RNA sequence: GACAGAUUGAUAGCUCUUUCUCGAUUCCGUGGGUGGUGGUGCAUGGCCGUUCUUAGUUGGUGGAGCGAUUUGUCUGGUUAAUUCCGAUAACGAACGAGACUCUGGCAUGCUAACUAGUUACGCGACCCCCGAGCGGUCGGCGUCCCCCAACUUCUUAGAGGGACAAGUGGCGUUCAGCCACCCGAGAUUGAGCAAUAACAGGUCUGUGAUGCCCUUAGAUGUCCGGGGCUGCACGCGCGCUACACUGACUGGCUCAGCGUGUGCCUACCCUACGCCGGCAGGCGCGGGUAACCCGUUGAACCCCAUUCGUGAUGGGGAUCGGGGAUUGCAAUUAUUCCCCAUGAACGAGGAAUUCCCAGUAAGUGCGGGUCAUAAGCUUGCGUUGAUUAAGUCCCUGCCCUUUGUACACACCGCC
C-alpha cells in the first residue's frame, strides 16, 4: 500500500496531521499575513496549510525523483484574473514551497540531491508512507 | 565626423529589412530580417514553400 | 567560429546567401541570360556553377569579369582567398528556360522595338525550341495614357495543382523605358514530360500511357516441346 | 455523390479492357496490379481507381455485351 | 484526463483480447470479442477521429470572426 | 581631390589596390573591411565613390543596398594620376589565368 | 585506429538525403567495421505565416510558408580514411554533413 | 577642421572677438542633381483583394448560317462539380473542376534508431517498510546504473500497404449512378494549388519597381528635443469580462502540442538548480546549433477536497489614494509588473443581424507571430467537449436553360 495504492487525497489529510501531532517541523512567521501565491485573491482558511502542503510537497518528491523550488511553484498554480483581462498562469510562491522543502529539510524528509533539486531520504520516505499503511488500515471506506 | 546619436541598439531605429531597408512588418524570427513583402520575393529562393 | 549556428537559422541563412547572389547575379549578368546558380559547397572551398548564355561577356577582357564577381563573393558572404570559385557554364537549350527568354525580351524591347513583333519573336522562339505550351503577357502603358494587358498564348499549359510547381518555368521581369514600366511575364510549360531523360514523374497524374497487347496471337491446337 | 468516375479513369479502364480482356478478371485486387505492370499510372489512387470499372464493366459483360 | 480512460479502457481489452489469443485458445477470444463489441464504446475499435486544424479568419476550425457589415 | 585627406588617399590607394571594392550603404558604420585606418565608413567611400562614377572614373550596382563598385579602365588614369603611381601601376587585375 | 564516429546528415530533401544515408550505409558495409543504422529525429518544421497582401487590403487571406529540415544521423567505428572516403563521395545537393570526432 | 564663456536645449565654432592647425581640402556662381513615409494607385510594374473553391472557359475538324455568329457547349437522369451517359449535325480535343501536393487519421506488417523511447526485461542491483506481507514472496514510484540486454509494445521518421461505391440487398431509363447493409477508415478528415475574363477594388507609405509632377538648402534632403499620433459634449467597428451557485472564492490531484529558444548583419536569449524577499522580484550559481538543456514541457478549464447561501453578495470587478519592483539614458503622457488601498455599471440586454453539421459550435489555457520593454491582437495547438439541420429554396445571393427586354456607365438602368 505505497502513496499510489493509498487514495492519495486522503494521503496529505492524515500526513498533515503526523507532522501536527509531531509537534516538529518549524512553522514560522511570514505565515498568519501570507498571500500564498500572487495567483490567489485571498488568505487561506485552514490555518495550517503548510503541514498540508509541506504534506503534499513531500510525498510529490516520493513520486517524482527530484524537484526544485522552481518546480514546487510550478505545480501549484492556478487561472488567475487580471481582471477584465483573460485568464492566464502564474507560478506558486516560491519564498513558501522554499520554507517547506527546508524546514521537511530540519526533520530529514528530503534532501538536497545530486544534479540540483530537492528528493525525499530514506528516513522521510518512512514518516511519509509509514501512514499509508495507517490510512488504508485506517479502514476500508 | 560627430553626432548620428540615440540607441540605434533595439527599437526599429535600429533593426529594418536587408533587401530594402524598410522599417516594419518586418519578420524577425529565425534571423531573416526581411520585411514582410521581401519574403515572397526572396523566398522561394530561400526555401519556404508553400504545402498546405 | 564555435556559433555552430542551428539546422533552423543556418538553412535559412544559406537560403538567403542563395537569394542575396541569385539577385546581383540576375542584376548584372541579365543582358548575358543568367539563368542561374547551384551553389556547389565542397571541402576548403564554394563553388557556384552561374549557369548563363553568352559566356564571351562573362569572361571579358581575357577573363576578368569572372575575377571581378569571384573577388566581390569573397567581400561580400565571407569567403578566404581561395575559398570561392565561380564558375561560368553555357545553359542547355536556351529556349526552355524562362527568364533567360523574359530577360531576351526586357532587352528586344529596350533595343527599340514594338511589342508585338517582338514577344512573337520570343513566343515563336520558344515553341520551336522545344516546348509543351507557353505564354507571355506584356502589362503596362502600351502607347497610350491608359494601361493595356497584352497575352498571346501558344500550345498547352496547366494552370493548377502541385503539377504546376515542377513544370512550367514562370518567370516576372520589369523594364523600364524612355516612357514608363511594363511587366513581362514569360511562363513556358516543359515537354520533359515526354522525355525529361527520366522526366520527373513524366505523367502530368491525368496522363496513362497504356502499353499495347504487343503480341497475344495464337488459339491453334495444343502441341508441345523440348528443350 | 462523392465518387462518379472521370474521363482519365472510365477512358483508360475502357481501352485496358478492349487490349486485355483475357488478362482481367472479376476480382479488384488482382487485375488492380495488373494495370501496373501493362500501364504507367502515376499515382497510386488512380492506379487503384482504374481497376474501378475494370471490374464494373466485368459485371455488365458477363451479363451482356 | 478523460481521454487517458478510453484509451486504458481500450487497452486492457485489447490487451486481454491479445491474450486468450495469441498463446491460450480462440473460442474465449471470440466469447471475449463478442462480449465487448455487442457494445464497443470503442473498446477494440480506435476511435477514427482526431481534432480539425484552425484556419485564418476564424477562432476554431470552422467558425468566423464576425463579419462587420455597414 | 577633396574632403578628409589623410582617410581619402587611403580610400583611393584601396580602390587602385584592389580589382574591386564592395561596401555598405550604412553611415553608421565608423570602420568598413579592409583599410579603415581609422572611422572612413560608408561616407568618405560612398562621398568618393558616388563621385568617381559621375564623372566617370569607376561604374556601380547597388543590389539589396550594398553599392557595387567596379573599377573603370578610364579611372586606372584618373587614380594613378592622382595617386602619382608608377606608369606600369598594375592595379589588381593582373590575372595569371591559365 | 578505430574511433566513435558520428555521421550527422541535414537536410531539407528527404529525397536527395536518403540516397547519401543509404550510400554510407553501403559505403561502409563494402568495407564492413560496425554501423547501428539511421536515426530519424523529428523533422522539423520552419512555419512563417505572412499577410497575401502587401499594403493593407482585402479580406484577410495569408499563406502559410514551410521549410522541412530532417535529420538523419549515422554511427559508425573506422580510421582516418574510412571517414574521408565515405564522407566526400556522396555529397552534391543541397546536404550539410558533420563529423563528430568520438563521443561527445 | 577649433580646448574656458554670451549663449543655446546642446561641451550645436550653428553663430558675435581670439585666434592657434589640415592644408589644396576649401568657400561663391551656374547648370545639375539627390533625396524626400512629398504629390498623384484615373501616369504605371509587381504583388495583392475580389466577381469567385462559383461552375465555368476554349479552341481543330465537321454541320448551320452571305456574315457578326452559332452548334459541338443539351430536353431528361445524374453529379460536390458542360462531371457523365445518352438522347445527339456532330466527331474526336484543350484549360478550369477532377487527378496532384501537403495534411489528417487503419497499419504487435518492414527498416532502423544512447539527439526517441525506451520496453519489458535479465531484472544483476541501491534501496528504504516507499509500501504488502511473520518470513518467503509481491505492488510500486525513485533511482545504480551502466551496458559488451534486447527491442521496437507506444516515440520518431524512412520505405510500404490500404480504402478502392471495393461486396450483397434495394431503388434507379435498371446506363450514369443514388440509397441501405457486410467486412471496415464506407464511396466525402482539412487546406494549397485554382481557368477564361474582369474591376480607376487596394497598394506609389513592402519594394534601389517607378511614370510624370512637385520640392530641393531656410531645404518636404537626415535628424535632436520635445510634442502629437493616446487627446474628448457625442457616433459607429471588430475583442475581452461579467452578470453567477451545472456557480463563487478556500484545501488539494493531475493529464500536451504546435512550437519556441543563447550565444542572431552590429549587441544582443532560452533558461534548469542554490540562497535572499511577501511579491514584483531580488540576489547565487548550472545545461543549451538543441528529439540532449529548459523539458516525464508536471495546465485550465477540467478533476477532485472544504467556504457561501441566492445578497449587485465573495460575482463583478471598473475608477481613483498610496507604496514597492523591472525594462529601459529617459515612462511626465497611470510603459510593464508587483504590493497594498478605493472600490463602479452589469441580475442576460431595446431596433437588428453571423456561424455552422463531427471531433463541429462553445469554454479552456497554452505556444507562435507581434517584443529592450511588453499584449484584450491575431495564427496554430491541443484539451474539455455539446445541442441540432442532414433538407429546402421560404428570405439573401450564385449557377445553367427557355423567354421578355426602349437596359449595353447594363436597373444603383433607361424614362
Not at chain 2, 524598410?22 to 526555401?47: E, P, S, T, V
Not at chain 3, 559547397?41 to 577582357?61: C, H, K, S, W
Amino acid at each position: 500500500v505505497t502513496v499510489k495504492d493509498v487514495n492519495q487525497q486522503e494521503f496529505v489529510r492524515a500526513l498533515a496531521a503526523f507532522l501536527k501531532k509531531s509537534g516538529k517541523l518549524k512553522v514560522p512567521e511570514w505565515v498568519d499575513t501570507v498571500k500564498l501565491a500572487k495567483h490567489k485573491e485571498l488568505a487561506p482558511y485552514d490555518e495550517n496549510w503548510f503541514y498540508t502542503r509541506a504534506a503534499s510537497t513531500a510525498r510529490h518528491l516520493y513520486l517524482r525523483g527530484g524537484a526544485g523550488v522552481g518546480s514546487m511553484t510550478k505545480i501549484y498554480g492556478g487561472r488567475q484574473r487580471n481582471g477584465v483581462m483573460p485568464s492566464h498562469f502564474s507560478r506558486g510562491s516560491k519564498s513558501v514551497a522554499r520554507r517547506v522543502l527546508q524546514a521537511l529539510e530540519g526533520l530529514k524528509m528530503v534532501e538536497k540531491d545530486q544534479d540540483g533539486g530537492r528528493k525525499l531520504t530514506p528516513q522521510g520516505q518512512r514518516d511519509l508512507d509509514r501512514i499509508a499503511g495507517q490510512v488504508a488500515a485506517a479502514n476500508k471506506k | 565626423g560627430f553626432y548620428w546619436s540615440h540607441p540605434r541598439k533595439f527599437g526599429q531605429g535600429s533593426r529594418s529589412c536587408r533587401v530594402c531597408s524598410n522599417r516594419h512588418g518586418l519578420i524577425r524570427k529565425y534571423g531573416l530580417n526581411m520585411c514582410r513583402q521581401c519574403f515572397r520575393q526572396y523566398a522561394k529562393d530561400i526555401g519556404f514553400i508553400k504545402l498546405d | 567560429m564555435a556559433v555552430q549556428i542551428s539546422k533552423k537559422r543556418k538553412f535559412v541563412a544559406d537560403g538567403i546567401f542563395k537569394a542575396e547572389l541569385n539577385e546581383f547575379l540576375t542584376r548584372e549578368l541579365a543582358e548575358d541570360g543568367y539563368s542561374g546558380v547551384e551553389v556547389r559547397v565542397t571541402p576548403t572551398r564554394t563553388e557556384i556553377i552561374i549557369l548563363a548564355t553568352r559566356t564571351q561577356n562573362v569572361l571579358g577582357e581575357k577573363g576578368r569579369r569572372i575575377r571581378e564577381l569571384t573577388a566581390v563573393v569573397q567581400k561580400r558572404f565571407g569567403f578566404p582567398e581561395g575559398s570561392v570559385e565561380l564558375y561560368a557554364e553555357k545553359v542547355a537549350t536556351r529556349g526552355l528556360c524562362a527568364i533567360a527568354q523574359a530577360e531576351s525580351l526586357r532587352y528586344k524591347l529596350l533595343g527599340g522595338l514594338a511589342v508585338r513583333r517582338a514577344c512573337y519573336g520570343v513566343l515563336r522562339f520558344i515553341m520551336e525550341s522545344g516546348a509543351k505550351g507557353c505564354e507571355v503577357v506584356v502589362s503596362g502603358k502600351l502607347r497610350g495614357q491608359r494601361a493595356k494587358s497584352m497575352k498571346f498564348v501558344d500550345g498547352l499549359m496547366i494552370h493548377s495543382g502541385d503539377p504546376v510547381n515542377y513544370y512550367v518555368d514562370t518567370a516576372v521581369r520589369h523594364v523600364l523605358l524612355r516612357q514608363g514600366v511594363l511587366g513581362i511575364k514569360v511562363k513556358i510549360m516543359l515537354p520533359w514530360d515526354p522525355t525529361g531523360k527520366i522526366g520527373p514523374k513524366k505523367p502530368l497524374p491525368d496522363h496513362v500511357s497504356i502499353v499495347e497487347p504487343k503480341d497475344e496471337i495464337l488459339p491453334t491446337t495444343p502441341i508441345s516441346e523440348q528443350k | 455523390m462523392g465518387r462518379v468516375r472521370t474521363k482519365t479513369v472510365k477512358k483508360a479502364a475502357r481501352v485496358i479492357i478492349e487490349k486485355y480482356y483475357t488478362r482481367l478478371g472479376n476480382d479488384f485486387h488482382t487485375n488492380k496490379r495488373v494495370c501496373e505492370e501493362i500501364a504507367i499510372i502515376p499515382s497510386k489512387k488512380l492506379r487503384n481507381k482504374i481497376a474501378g470499372y475494370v471490374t464494373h464493366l466485368m459485371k455488365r459483360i458477363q451479363r451482356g455485351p | 484526463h478523460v481521454a487517458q480512460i478510453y484509451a486504458i479502457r481500450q487497452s486492457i481489452s485489447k490487451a486481454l483480447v491479445a491474450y486468450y489469443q495469441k498463446y491460450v485458445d480462440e473460442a474465449s477470444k471470440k466469447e471475449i470479442k463478442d462480449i465487448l463489441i455487442q457494445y464497443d464504446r470503442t473498446l477494440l475499435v480506435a476511435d477514427p477521429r482526431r481534432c480539425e486544424s484552425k484556419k485564418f479568419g476564424g477562432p476554431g476550425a470552422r467558425a468566423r470572426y464576425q463579419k462587420s457589415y455597414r | 581631390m577633396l574632403m578628409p585627406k589623410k582617410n581619402r588617399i587611403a580610400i583611393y590607394e584601396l580602390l587602385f589596390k584592389e580589382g574591386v571594392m564592395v561596401a555598405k550603404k550604412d553611415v553608421h558604420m565608423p570602420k568598413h573591411p579592409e583599410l579603415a585606418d581609422k572611422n572612413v565608413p560608408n561616407l568618405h567611400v560612398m562621398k568618393a565613390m558616388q563621385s568617381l562614377k559621375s564623372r566617370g572614373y569607376v561604374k556601380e550596382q547597388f543590389a539589396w543596398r550594398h553599392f557595387y563598385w567596379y573599377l573603370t579602365n578610364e579611372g586606372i588614369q584618373y587614380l594613378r594620376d592622382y595617386l602619382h603611381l608608377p606608369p606600369e601601376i598594375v592595379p589588381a587585375t593582373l590575372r595569371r589565368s591559365r | 585506429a578505430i574511433h566513435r564516429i558520428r555521421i550527422t546528415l541535414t537536410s531539407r530533401n528527404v529525397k536527395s538525403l536518403e540516397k547519401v544515408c543509404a550510400d554510407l550505409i553501403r559505403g561502409a558495409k563494402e568495407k564492413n567495421l560496425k554501423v547501428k543504422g539511421p536515426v530519424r529525429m523529428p523533422t522539423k518544421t520552419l512555419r512563417i505565416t505572412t499577410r497575401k497582401t502587401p499594403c493593407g487590403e482585402g479580406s484577410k487571406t495569408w499563406d502559410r510558408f514551410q521549410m522541412r529540415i530532417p535529420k538523419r544521423l549515422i554511427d559508425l567505428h573506422s580510421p582516418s580514411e574510412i571517414v574521408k572516403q565515405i564522407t566526400s563521395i556522396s555529397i552534391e545537393p543541397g546536404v550539410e554533413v558533420e563529423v563528430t570526432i568520438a563521443d561527445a
